[PDB]
Amino acid sequence: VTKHAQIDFPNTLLDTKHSTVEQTAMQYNDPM
């Protein structure tokens, strides 16, 4: 069993047109 990583802000209604390092910083709970 692997526990998925969690962020504070919801991922619903987030734009997928962001850059790759912006989504990278966004998903690891440390946004730019």
Partner 1 sequence: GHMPTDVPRLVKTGNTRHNRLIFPLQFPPATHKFNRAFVDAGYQRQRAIT
Partner 2 sequence: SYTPNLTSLTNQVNRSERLRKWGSAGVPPGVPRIPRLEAKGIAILHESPKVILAGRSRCNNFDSNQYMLINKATKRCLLVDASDDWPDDWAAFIGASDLTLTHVFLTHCHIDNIINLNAFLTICGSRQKQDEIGVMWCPAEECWVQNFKRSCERYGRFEEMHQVLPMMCRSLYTPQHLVDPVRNARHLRRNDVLLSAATNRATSFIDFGNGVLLYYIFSPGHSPGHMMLHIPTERILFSGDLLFFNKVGRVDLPWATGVRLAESLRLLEALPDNTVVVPGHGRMTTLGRERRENKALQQCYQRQEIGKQEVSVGFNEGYL
Partner RNA sequence: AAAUUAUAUUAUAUUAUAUUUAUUCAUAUAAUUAAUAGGAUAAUAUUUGUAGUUUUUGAUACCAUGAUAAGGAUUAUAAAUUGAAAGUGUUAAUAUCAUAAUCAAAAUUUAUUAUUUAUAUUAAAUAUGUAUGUGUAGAUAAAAUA
1 to 32: interface string for partner 1, x by CB under 8 A? xxx-----------------------------
First to last CA, the chain: 31
Least separation in angstroms between CB 7 and partner 1: 16
Which residue do the tokens 């962020």 mark? 7
Of 2 and 12, which has the nearer Cβ to RNA? 2
Distance CA 31, CA 2 (A): 24
Contact 4, 26 (CB under 8 A): no
Q: Give the residues lining the site for partner 2 (CB under 8 A).
A: 19-22, 24-25, 28-32
